[PDB]
């Protein structure tokens, strides 16, 4: 899939993408509900993090999969952007739960329709 990380219209291009098309992206992509439960999780993300994309869908990202993100700097921004019903934040972060510490760039952005949220990830 020909989509760049950070692109201005990313929520339109990825809108309603199926799991197979999401696996074609150059960067990691996760879709969460407003509680943080994982709806979609692509192959590029699994290659970065080690998680198995099939097994994590349905788990809670903040409570279960990614406790290192349960902090004001990641989860706090997520829950505030959900609450305003609007979210568009980009920041670097380190993933270090049961893995070699890996620094990434994270982009969280509200998905176009409904009440869903994207978490995009690439290495830095
Ligand atoms: C910290 O616990 C980070 C964990 C993590 C980040 C991103 C993922 O896709 C999976 C786990």
Among protein residues, the one whose CA lies closest to atom 4 of ligand 1 = 66
| Residue span of the structural domain in which 49 resides | 10-123
**Cα of 21 to ligand 1 centre, how many Å?**
22
Q: Count how many domains the chain has.
A: 1
CATH value at residue 112: 3.30.450.20
- Specify the resolution in Å: 1.0
Specify if 118 maps to a domain: yes
Among protein residues, the one whose CA lies closest to atom 8 of ligand 1 = 49
**Cα of 81 to ligand 1 centre, how many Å?**
19
CA angle 82, 85, 86 (to 5 degrees): 90
3-state SS, residue 24: coil
Strand order in the sheet with 38-41: 38-41, 28-33, 116-123, 102-110, 88-95
**Cα of 64 to ligand 1 centre, how many Å?**
10
CA nearest 121: which of 38, 25, 21? 25
Distance linking the first and last C-alpha atoms of the chain: 21
Which whole-number Å values give the CA distances from 43 to 13, 72, 82, 83, 85, in the listed order? 18, 27, 25, 29, 28
Determine contact, residues 62/36, Cβ cutoff 8 Å.
yes
């Amino acid at each position: 899939e020909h989509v760049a990380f950070g692109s201005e219209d990313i929520e339109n291009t990825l809108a309603k993408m199926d799991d197979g098309q999401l696996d074609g992206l150059a960067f990691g992509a996760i879709q969460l509900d407003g509680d943080g439960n994982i709806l979609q999780y692509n192959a590029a993300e699994g290659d970065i993090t080690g998680r198995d994309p099939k097994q994590v869908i349905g788990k809670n990202f903040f409570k279960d999969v990614a406790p290192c993100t349960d902090s004001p700097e990641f989860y706090g921004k997520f829950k505030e952007g959900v609450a305003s019903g609007n979210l568009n934040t980009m920041f670097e972060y380190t993933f270090d739960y049961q893995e070699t510490p890996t620094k990434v760039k994270v982009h969280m952005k509200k998905a176009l329709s409904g009440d869903s949220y994207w978490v995009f990830v690439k290495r830095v």
